[PDB]
Design an enzyme around this catalytic site. Structure first.
Site, mmCIF file in Angstrom:
data_model
loop_
_atom_site.group_PDB
_atom_site.id
_atom_site.type_symbol
_atom_site.label_atom_id
_atom_site.label_comp_id
_atom_site.label_asym_id
_atom_site.label_seq_id
_atom_site.Cartn_x
_atom_site.Cartn_y
_atom_site.Cartn_z
ATOM 1 N N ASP A 275 37.508 46.073 49.682
ATOM 2 C CA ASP A 275 37.780 44.613 49.736
ATOM 3 C C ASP A 275 38.616 44.245 50.971
ATOM 4 O OD1 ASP A 275 37.588 42.028 48.739
ATOM 5 O OD2 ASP A 275 39.513 42.163 47.739
ATOM 6 N N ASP B 79 48.557 37.908 58.139
ATOM 7 C CA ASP B 79 47.161 38.377 58.039
ATOM 8 C C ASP B 79 46.345 37.867 59.243
ATOM 9 O OD1 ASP B 79 45.633 35.840 57.020
ATOM 10 O OD2 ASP B 79 47.377 35.983 55.769
ATOM 11 N N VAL C 206 44.351 34.805 42.392
ATOM 12 C CA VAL C 206 44.141 34.787 40.917
ATOM 13 C C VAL C 206 45.171 35.732 40.284
ATOM 14 C CG1 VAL C 206 42.497 35.333 39.044
ATOM 15 C CG2 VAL C 206 41.689 34.133 41.074
#
Ligand SMILES: CSc1ncc2cc3cnccc3c([N+](=O)[O-])c2n1
Length: 328
Positions: A179, A141, A24
């Site tokens: 997070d 990742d 986003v």
């Protein structure tokens, strides 16, 4: 004042940009300068247009990520509390302009091959402000490495690197990531056998198993210096606490329970929650090229199960690092 994109991305560097990530928030590009890969995180600020279906952050709302990226990058050069387990920050710029066509070209290739959830960022006028964060390239990742790690031995090194890094940040900065989903753990080949950290003046090593971990993305993170707290106030957020389909979305709820919806307070148990989520990911969603077939390996597997079973009864990453049996 602000500078043009060209200040951050001269022709050469712009022509070598490949898109490697999105959210986003905006876009992440890989490129090369002085033979050295870097990642460029580009965020639109201060504008009235929705981007990827959300309001742009103001300068004031993006400051905390800028401040925390710098603080955690600086730990690589400190003495009493030293770690490389976060991501090196090369530079921060405030950029003004429309989106470079050459970044749109990288954006389109990504949309074609991998597909994108974002708006094509082609609708920005020449007065549009962005923050450009340039990072050292940290690798790929843990999610995208689901099927790529060699054995659970590697898992132990990753959890050890992560715990040590969070502990150092706890001691230095009263840090919470808040997070740390497996999208925010990067892995990179290293020829180093031992990796070094210092916590409260005391230096130790972690066997790399040929990987170097980098924690990224400080958009929800918290820390403090001299009792000044930098954080993201999500007291009034709705969507963050209403997710399901993954243990990830429980951690948002479990964090809010631990801190009674007061996000300015220091609750380092949040680091333990995220480490439990990551440990849980290692046992349930990661799949290794080599299973545990030999006896010394099935021991490592039992110790990670035991970690998963116990770690929630520790108060911080520091408590885990210094008191948990996995790390003795
Ligand atoms: C925030 S989504 C994302 N996706 C992928 C990434 C890859 C990266 C590689 N190296 C260094 C930094 C990197 C970042 N980042 O911190 O913005 C990445 N970020």
């Amino acid at each position: 004042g602000p500078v043009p994109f060209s200040h951050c991305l001269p022709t050469e560097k712009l022509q070598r940009c490949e898109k490697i990530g999105e959210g986003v928030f905006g876009e992440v590009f890989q490129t090369i300068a002085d033979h050295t890969p870097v990642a460029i995180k580009i965020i639109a600020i201060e504008g009235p247009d929705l981007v990827n279906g959300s309001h742009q952050k103001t300068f004031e709302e993006i400051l905390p990520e800028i401040i925390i990226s710098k603080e955690l990058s600086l730990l690589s050069g400190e003495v009493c509390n030293r770690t490389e387990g976060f991501i090196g920050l090369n530079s921060v710029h405030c950029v003004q302009g429309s989106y470079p066509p050459l970044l749109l070209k990288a954006w389109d290739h990504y949309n074609s091959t991998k597909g994108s959830a974002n708006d094509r960022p082609d609708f920005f006028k020449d007065d549009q402000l962005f923050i450009v964060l340039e990072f050292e390239f940290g690798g790929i990742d843990l999610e995208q490495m689901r099927t790529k790690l060699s054995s659970l031995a590697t898992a132990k090194s990753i959890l050890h690197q992560l715990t040590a890094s969070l502990a150092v940040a706890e001691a230095s900065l009263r840090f919470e990531h808040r997070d740390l989903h497996w999208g925010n753990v990067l892995l990179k080949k290293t020829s180093l056998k031992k990796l070094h950290y210092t916590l409260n003046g005391k230096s130790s090593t972690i066997p790399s198993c040929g990987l170097q971990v980098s924690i990224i993305d400080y958009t929800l993170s918290r820390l403090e210096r001299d009792g000044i707290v930098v954080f993201c106030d999500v007291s009034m957020d709705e969507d963050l606490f209403t997710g399901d389909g993954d243990y990830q979305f429980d951690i948002y709820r479990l964090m809010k329970k631990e801190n009674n919806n007061r996000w300015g307070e220091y609750h380092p148990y949040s680091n333990v929650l995220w480490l439990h989520y990551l440990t849980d990911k290692m046992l349930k969603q990661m799949t290794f090229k080599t299973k545990c077939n030999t006896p010394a390996m099935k021991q490592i597997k039992r110790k990670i199960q035991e970690f998963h079973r116990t770690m929630l009864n520790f108060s911080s990453a520091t408590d885990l690092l210094c008191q948990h049996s996995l790390f003795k």
